[PDB]
Design a binder for this molecule. Structure first.
Ligand SMILES: [Ca+2]
Lengths: 267, 272
């Protein structure tokens, strides 16, 4: 089987949710995982920290590094990348997972909220790519994997929540540009997005668990990077190609019709 | 088709395209709020909110000089409030903005990335947000953003990702705003020049001589043609100056050339 043994992953926002799931799937292989996230001090209101994540990585079979990194701050990103290189010797894989969401219209989106989304999503992916690339370019099989949808100019999607669509498609379009620039230099710069809503008026019973994205990420990240860039991939399709065709186990409640994810057309 | 008595809020209109738009509207008797950062002049990049407001007055309009850095939400809100207190409303918002940096990602410092996102995409969003409550009450409301048609062309994204994100961001904000508010009868559209336009910003375009450009007045005149259209049923369009002017019966564009002895340079972000 393909493995991330010996590889070093820098994963943003991986104190919880999809980032943590991806971290743990890589850890199972013996990967080094740098958890770069803002949450350091334990808060019951939003459980999970860089430190709990690093411990979970260690318990899952990997080597965890907890890095206090508010990715809105370039200096913290730079410091976290240097720490990762100092601890593990390099960076093989960047996963741009950190994301903030808010589905209201423009008159109902305070600039504080708009700014949080732009800074964490599109800007966070850009600055992390910028900081990691010098090290990625020296690795044997470098990946940047951004958790973002295929780019779209669908006016309905844009009008539905312009602030969030700007920030999330921003991640997609940063991926598009990075892939165009650096893909030809051997870096696999791609995106991965879930078919359904992931449980991390939206009902978790109509969702899938984050392990679908962890397993899909694994399938992408173990691919040869040379010649593999600018792709916008979906979890179910990735897993099918990898030989995982029975997705029933990923369902929170397998008797429920699944909620479709934002930013994918339904055929 | 006149802008007489209409109130325009134009960002960055101390010089260049914004100023030209301001003066074309002034000629009709429009009220123009000049929302820009420069209050006092410097040798390098002339024009201030005060010279622009004075020029609007000289041209036949009513100018209002507003010291406004559009990076600052509080200043934008303050400027919009002052405009309403001065003229009674806002009929037209023109999102005009200049922050360019044509380099690759490793050569695009975060300070420059941030300047671009803040002035371009964010600036358009925050000004739209602040003006919309007033636009929605106006007889013939427009938002006109000076931005290109949205494109997913990978070459354009790869060439200078930070800048493309920022400027396409203005287009994408327009796309979303039009989808949300267009149905309420707000004419939310974009306008982009076929060619490069001669302004201070050509300094950020290596090799580009003003002589191979068009004058800002082509954008001023195309803007006027857009802004005097009925707003109902006219949203989500990404318009080009030459095409707008052709529809308006202006097909001879030769007078808009800076220098007829030079071939015109095609603009960024348009397929040839
Ligand atoms: Ca919505």
């Amino acid at each position: 089987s393909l493995t991330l043994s010996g590889k070093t992953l820098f994963i943003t926002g991986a104190s919880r949710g999809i980032g943590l799931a991806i971290a743990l799937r890589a850890a199972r292989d013996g990967a080094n995982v740098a958890i770069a996230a803002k949450s350091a001090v334990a808060n019951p209101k939003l459980p999970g920290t860089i430190h709990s994540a690093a411990a979970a990585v260690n318990a899952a079979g990997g080597q965890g590094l907890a890095l206090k990194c508010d990715i809105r701050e370039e200096d913290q990103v730079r410091a976290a990348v240097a720490a990762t290189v100092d601890t593990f010797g390099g960076i093989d894989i960047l996963v741009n997972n950190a994301s903030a969401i808010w589905l209201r219209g423009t008159l109902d989106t305070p600039m504080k909220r708009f700014d949080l989304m732009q800074q964490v999503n599109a800007r966070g992916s850009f600055v992390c790519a910028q900081a990691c690339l010098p090290h990625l370019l020296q690795a044997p099989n470098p990946h940047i994997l951004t958790l973002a949808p295929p780019p779209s100019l669908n006016p309905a999607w844009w009008g539905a929540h312009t602030g969030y669509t700007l920030a999330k498609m921003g991640m997609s379009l940063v991926t598009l540009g990075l892939a165009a620039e650096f893909g030809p230099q051997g870096v696999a710069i791609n995106a991965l997005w879930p078919r359904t809503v992931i449980a991390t008026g939206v009902d978790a019973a109509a969702c899938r668990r984050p392990e679908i994205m962890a397993d899909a990420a694994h399938a992408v990240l173990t691919r040869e990077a040379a010649g593999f860039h600018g792709q916008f991939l979906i979890d179910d399709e990735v897993l099918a190609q990898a030989g995982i065709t029975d997705l029933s186990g990923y369902a929170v409640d397998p008797q429920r019709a699944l909620l479709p994810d934002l930013f994918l057309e339904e055929g």
